[PDB]
Curated annotation (Swiss-Prot):
Subcellular localization(s) per the UniProt record: Virion membrane; Host cell membrane; Host endosome membrane
Topological category with respect to the lipid bilayer: Single-pass type I membrane protein
Designated name of the protein: Transmembrane protein gp41
Quaternary state and interactors: The mature envelope protein (Env) consists of a homotrimer of non-covalently associated gp120-gp41 heterodimers. The resulting complex protrudes from the virus surface as a spike. There seems to be as few as 10 spikes on the average virion.
Cysteine disulfide links: 4-10
Source taxon at top rank: Viruses
Primary role: Acts as a class I viral fusion protein. Under the current model, the protein has at least 3 conformational states: pre-fusion native state, pre-hairpin intermediate state, and post-fusion hairpin state. During fusion of viral and target intracellular membranes, the coiled coil regions (heptad repeats) assume a trimer-of-hairpins structure, positioning the fusion peptide in close proximity to the C-terminal region of the ectodomain. The formation of this structure appears to drive apposition and subsequent fusion of viral and target cell membranes.
Length: 13
């Protein structure tokens, strides 16, 4: 969770 909503799979960007 690294600042986006919708696609909840974000390690850095």
């Amino acid at each position: 969770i690294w600042g986006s909503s919708g696609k909840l799979i974000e390690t850095t960007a």
